[PDB]
Symmetry: C2
């Protein structure tokens, strides 16, 4: 198998300016059934909550969809387009 | 063309326009119109318009999952969520 690489999850966690609440709302929308519910992630996060959520999204192959959701909300908050595109470039495909 | 699946999701969901719009913002791919574009374009039911665009741009399945996830948090019965997911199908 492939060893888990969380560098892309770490990059997204170090990029987004959304609140925990907006990140949670994105997660609830994009979460596939085989990924843990948001409350499970919240209860599990020893350190950074957003990092925990993005690690789970990596584990369950939906970090690309979660990154797109985060980018869409940042775009509505007038985050500059090239910064959204930089994030999307860094996070990649799942 | 045939919007049967978008129409069925429109009838099935009990979410508010606000929650549907929040789902749409999260799942919308770049080639699909932004939520504010959809709202501006809608002449009839807003949820129907959103779900027709999701059908057009091949993400109605992802939007249906988002809808089901919020319905689940509102205690919608599990089998009703699963019925909806079966009717929407794959994109």
């Amino acid at each position: 198998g492939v060893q888990a690489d969380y560098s892309r999850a770490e990059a997204l966690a170090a990029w987004t300016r959304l609140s925990d609440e907006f990140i949670g709302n994105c997660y609830v929308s994009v979460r596939p059934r085989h990924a843990p519910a948001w409350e499970v992630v919240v209860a599990s996060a020893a350190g950074s909550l957003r990092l925990e959520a993005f690690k789970r999204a990596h584990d369950h192959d939906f970090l690309d969809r979660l990154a797109v959701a985060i980018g869409n909300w940042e775009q509505k908050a007038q985050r500059p387009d090239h910064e959204i595109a930089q994030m999307l470039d860094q996070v990649g495909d799942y």
